């Protein structure tokens, strides 16, 4: 897995950030699918959640390893994702952010 991050400091990372586009909670929907759970899962596999092909067509799935180099730059992971962040070039936020999504099961 990933470096080693501050679950509390990244739920507050989470809630400043990601939030913008994504929940915390289990199904739940926005302009991304929740985050609730994604740790382990496979990607394009959120109920109701509108994906996109480049996502679908991926064949990734969200280990902390791979997690931690999406979040910095999600178009070299995910070529054609909609996914509209620039990326997270502090590898502390990116480990801290992982930390907290770890608690979301
Ligand atoms: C916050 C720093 C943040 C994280 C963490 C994050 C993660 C993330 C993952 C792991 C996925 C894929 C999940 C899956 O396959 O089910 C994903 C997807 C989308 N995101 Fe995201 N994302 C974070 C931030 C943001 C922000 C700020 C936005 C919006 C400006 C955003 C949007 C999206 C969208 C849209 C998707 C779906 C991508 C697709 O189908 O191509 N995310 N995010």
């Known amino acids: ?50 994906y996109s092909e480049a996502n679908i067509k991926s064949g990734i799935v969200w280990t902390p390893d791979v997690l931690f180099k999406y979040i910095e730059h999600p178009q070299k992971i995910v070529p054609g994702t909609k996914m509209g962040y620039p990326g997270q070039p502090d590898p502390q936020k990116r480990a801290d952010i992982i930390a907290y999504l770890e608690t979301l099961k």
């Open 1 to 50: 897995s990933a470096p080693p991050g501050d679950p509390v400091e990244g739920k507050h990372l989470f809630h400043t950030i990601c939030i913008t586009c994504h929940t915390d909670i289990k199904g739940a929907n926005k302009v991304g699918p929740s985050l609730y759970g994604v740790v382990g899962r496979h990607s394009g596999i959120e109920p109701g959640y509108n």
